[PDB]
Every structure is written in C-alpha cells, then in structure tokens.
Ligand binder design. Sequence first.
Ligand SMILES: [Fe+2]
Length: 850
Amino acid sequence: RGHKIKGTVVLMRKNVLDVNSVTSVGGIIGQGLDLVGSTLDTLTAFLGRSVSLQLISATKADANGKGKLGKATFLEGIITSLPTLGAGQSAFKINFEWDDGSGIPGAFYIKNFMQTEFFLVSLTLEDIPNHGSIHFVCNSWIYNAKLFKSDRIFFANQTYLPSETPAPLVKYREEELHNLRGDGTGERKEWERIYDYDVYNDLGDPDKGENHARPVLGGNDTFPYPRRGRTGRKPTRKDPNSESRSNDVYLPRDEAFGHLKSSDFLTYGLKSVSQNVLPLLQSAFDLNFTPREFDSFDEVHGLYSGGIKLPTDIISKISPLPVLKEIFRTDGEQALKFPPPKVIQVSKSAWMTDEEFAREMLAGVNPNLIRCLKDFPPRSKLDSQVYGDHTSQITKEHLEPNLEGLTVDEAIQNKRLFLLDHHDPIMPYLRRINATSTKAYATRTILFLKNDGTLRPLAIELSLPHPQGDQSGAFSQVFLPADEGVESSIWLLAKAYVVVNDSCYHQLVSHWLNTHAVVEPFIIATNRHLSVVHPIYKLLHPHYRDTMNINGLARLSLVNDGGVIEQTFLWGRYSVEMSAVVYKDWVFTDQALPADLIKRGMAIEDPSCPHGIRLVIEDYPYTVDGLEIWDAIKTWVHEYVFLYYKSDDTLREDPELQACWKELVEVGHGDKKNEPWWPKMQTREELVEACAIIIWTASALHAAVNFGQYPYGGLILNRPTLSRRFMPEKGSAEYEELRKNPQKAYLKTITPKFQTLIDLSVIEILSRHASDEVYLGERDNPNWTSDTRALEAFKRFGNKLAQIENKLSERNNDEKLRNRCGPVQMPYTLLLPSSKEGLTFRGIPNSISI
Ligand SMILES: [Fe+2]
C-alpha cells in the first residue's frame, strides 16, 4: 500500500538565537510559553514554497548504487504544542509520499528557499513497516539553497563504522566528508562549513608598522605551534606570509553557538571589553578623573565595596552595553564595581601568609607545575649559557631553619622537597623584557612538606641575565622567609616576583597553549575525516562545543598584537612566541593526568592504591579530585570504544579513523610529526588513551585552570600579572619607602591601576558559566544515538559523576585536609562536575567554551 510517512521538523528561527535581536536586557530563559512556535505568526512564512525536504533511502539504490530519492516535499502545517517542545523551538508537520518499494529512509536533503537562515534541530519520522520511529539530530544552520552546490544532507540516528554503512548511503557519507574539507583555497565565508588548517600568521598587523609585526607560529623549527582553523583572507600588503586583519573571523558555521539569553553571549562580552570598554576606560587615565596609581591596599579593597568613581561620560557609554549589564555592577553614576573575589570573603589578609602562597600551588589557579625535587641544587635545561651547566645558587645552609630538623639529603630521600621552577622559559627573553617598562626576574621557589601535611616556602631565588654577557651564567640572589620588620616586606615582594612569573605562565601555557590551542587541530581533523555517523565522532563531538569560536575571538582580541594579554601580562610582546618555545616540550601522552603526576615526581606507580598510583603529597586537591574524574572519563571511553570495535584489526581497518589520526599528527600538530611518542592507531587501548586525553583536556583540565581565575586573582594583590620595579637595595631611597610605607612599595612594583581594571574585567568574564553551559557527563544535547548500549553506558558515566560529586563535597568537610580550604577558607570545588550559572567556583563543562 502507498503510504504517507509522518514527519515532524523542529527548528529555531534566527531571531531567537541571534545576539542582535536577543539583546534587550536578559534575565529569564528556558522559559516563556516555551516559545511554542505558533504564536506570533512569522511561522506562516515557513509554510508555502519555502522549505523542502527530500528523503533518501538507506536500503534501496538507483542503477549507480546511491540511495533512492523521494519527492521533494514542502512544510505543510504548524504544530502548536508537543510534550517535548522547548523554549524558542517551532514545530512543523510534513507528510512524505513513500511506498513499499523505496525502503527505510536513512538520510534527507533540505533546501531553504527563504532569505533568512534558520537553525534546524530535528527530524522525526513515524513510519510504515514493522519499524519504530526514525530520529535525525541535526543542530545546524540552514542557509539559502542558492548558496550551495549540493544540498545540505543529514543522516539518521544510527551509528555506523565505515564498513557498516548501508551500501546505498556509502557515496552520500563520503561526499559530505569531501564537502567538509574544501580544497584548501579560497576566502572563507560566514555560511560555509569548511574545516582546514593554517599556521598562526594571524596575530600581528605589519601593515600598521614593523613593531606591530609578530612572528609566524608553526611550520618552522624555532616557533612550532598547533595549527588553527583556516580563514582564507588576503595577505597583508607589507608581508606575504602574514594574513590581513579583520573584524570578523570566520569559523565553520555550526561551530558558532547562539544563545536564548543575552547574558550568555560571553565572547560578545569579551569582544566588547576589548573594542569598547578598553579604549573608553583608557581615556579616563589619559585624562585624570581617575588617579593613575593605587596608593594603599584599602584603595584596592574599594573596588569591591564602593567601586571606582568614573565620570558619567564614560559610565553611560559602558553601562547600556548589551551583555555587560550582568558583569559590570553599576550603582547609578559614579561607580564601576567588581564582585568580592572568594579569596577575601572570609579574610582580607590571609592571602599574604606563606601557607596560602604554598597551598595555591596545589589548589589554586595553576595547580599543575610543582615538582618533587630529585636532586640538589636544581638544574636548568638551558644550553651553552653557563648557569645551565651550573645550577640554582640556593644552598643547603639556606634551608635549615625551624620545622623538622632534617638535612637536605634526608629531605630529598624522604620526598619532602618540592620546586616551582620558573627559571627557563623567561630567561632567554629577560634582557628584552627588562628593556621595557616591565622589570622581572627568573625565579625558583623551594618548598618543604611539613609534618602537618601543609607546604611551606623555604627559599626564593631571583635571577637576572647578565652582568657581563649570557655566557657568564645567571646573576642570582636568594631570599628567605621572615615575619617581622623590613625583611618581611622584602619576602612579600620576593613572593610577588614568583607569582608574576606564575600568572604569565598560567595564562599563556597552562590555559592558552595546553587547552585552547592544542585542542583546535583535533576538532578540525575530526570533522574533516570522521562522518557525523561515526561512533568516535559522537564520542568526541560534545567536547568541542564553541571551542573554535572562543579561539577565533582570542586571535582577534586576546592574543593579537597590542591585545589584552600583551598589555596585561609579564611577557608582553613576546607572550605568544614564548608559548611556542614551551610547545617544543609539549608531549600529548604526558597530558594524561597520571602521566603528568608521575613526570613531575608527585606520584609513584603503586597497584596497592585506588587509582594505581601513590601520591607523594596526599592532600593535593587538584590531583586527588582530578584522578576521580580522569578515571571516570577513561572508564566511559573504554566501555564506549569496546562497544564498536570487535578486535584491534577492525580499528586498523577503519579508513575514517586512520585518516583522521594520520592528518592530526602530520598536519594538525604537524611540527611534531616525527616524535616517537604519538600513539599509532593500531590498538583499541591506544584509541582509549587518546580519546581520554582529549576529553580530559577539554573538560576537567580547562575547568581546573580556568574557573578559579577571578576567585583567586580578582584581588590583583594575590595574583599580580606583571612587575615594574626591581627589588629595593639595602641603602637606597626605595628601601626607605619600603620601610616607611610597604603597601605603596608593593603597589608600585606590581600591575598598575589601569591594567588591573582590564585584567579584572576580562577574568570576571572568563570565570563565569553561561546559563546554558552543558556539563561533563550527564549532559549531552538530545537523542544523539539509537544504540541503547551506548545510552546505558553514558548513563552509568553520569551516575558515577554524581557519586564523585558527593565524595568531593565530603572531602571539603574533612578537617584533616587543610590544603582543601587554607587560611583563606575557600573549599576547593573546582572539580565538582555540576554548577549553576555565574562565578561559581565549580562546574566542569564538556568543552573549552570560554
Ligand atoms: Fe579558556
């Protein structure tokens, strides 16, 4: 019998997801009469000769082997309500002529004949033979059909390895993969979905002047770098090897996510801080309605209570900015306020303590760098310059004080000495950096694990390049802890010089290089080579949400020439170059949490222990909490991979996975293509490991290093971003100023008031979860596969994360674990998987989304 297949299309109109139309001011969303489509009839526009869908048979082919096409059919009618219809979603009825000749639909083509694009959410088919409903999850913007050569195609729910693809769909699956790759030529346009690679030749503006030029990162041995998404803009006129600047940076269309709520448009907020808030605030300082300099610590604390008095000239141009109404507290006229950072909510002065300084290396914004000291004195990895065939100038006489009464040899034996080494990355650039307004040191800090389980800083080494040349080693000075008099003020400054090194390393390497930059080539390789239908595509896809968008924004506004990072952080104009130098030492398999802990000497392998490793510092909150989430991720990945691959041979035989990984190594991270540590993709265990590392990187690692930025460093005093003065010398006038007024001396050493305001405004956005964040584990978008085994496995994953959330909260109430809270009384909640919106100090998103 000839029968009609009943379809329901769910879509979302442009107006409901677009920044320009959704900006009134934003407060409630997910709500409304869950904007049921029908009401307010722009919906009738979709109902004529506007939108056509054409079914493609999965089980029946034409003469040349491609699935049989049905008749192009138009949207018939509006569905007013459905039990699962969401906020902003509109539903349409469409009935397809099909018969028992053309078999089971497995894909469809769609054509939009309207002027305006819409976001296609889903197709659902209610069918004909002994067959359940067929679901299609689309989540894609559909532009006008005249813009494309072949029609937009979408496949059903069914997950298929290349060998498992229904014969009539084989050519459709390969053709879309081809269309996603492009041909490597052309300027990319907004409506396109073309994924390809380019180097970082994107950040400078050499047409504006030679001092605005920035070196090309990647594709050479001096500055290797991961690739980023190809945009295809015309080169600069002055330099052929650099790409010209634009106010719009292309990314493949479905990588840019819209939002139902105005305040969830965070990249928009960030861009507005660069383009609108930064030049306008800079005008208050280039005048005098704001004094240029903080004069006291009380003046810093006033940012959070009464705020900073600005004229209403600037205030009335900054307060009605679309997304920024949430993050900028405004009393009325004479104040820009900032929310109190968690670090000072219980105690204003606890950050100054040695124990908080030390604790923040284990549970702070950059909890990833500390190493156990294996030999003494600490050595440098630098080349022919002679302090690197020499050592640190910290001596054994320096480390014998008050606490445990051990010798240095004993304390190394018993694994009680630890190092935070910031000597090598900055050293080669120090002479250049100190020729600007910045004055910095290369630092080392040695820490002792006390009997009470907490860490204590024992000595700080400050090093400068050269009395008489670089071949002459390091000029080093050593500073010891002190709690009274001028010597305590010196020690606080020594601590600030370390933290200034740490903040810059954190921003550029721990955060930017190790999450953002390193992940982007994996997104490109995945889309280029794995069909949407591939199991591993589905495993990885939630972990890529909005990453290319925030990275494109970073290229424009954050990491560009004269952008926020160069103006705010210690390394200045060398910031991104130096991160390429650090990338020379990046190894993919050491990003796995257990490998990292082992590599830094913070754990030893031990099968007697809960995660197979024994920690050397038991109360190391980042690492003990991280290991629960790492193990949950790796278990999920293993269960999932082993649903699909029957043997290692079926993995070796998979052409999509093999081409993905070959292009990842040879092109995406192509400056490291000959490194021997890359997984070969010859074994299911190597696939598990690679996939776990990408998901850990995108989710927990980025969250751990990102979401504590405002809570710890919203007080500039605790995490200063640059230094401007060398240490006061014993008989100068600066030492007397330190004696008479140490707060003023502290303040004129660290980040000035202007750059403090920029820093705070940026890290307040960076530390916020949007309302519509999708978190690790439980959360996905929809009906993403019809494989009930995968659904069950994913549910087990969600359940384990909820169990881990309870265990983690319980550790926060344990009084024996002092590193979890500190004198600052800030329970470590950074690795708690779930969160509400805002500046919470918690929540692990699936992806790098901000
Ligand atoms: Fe980020």
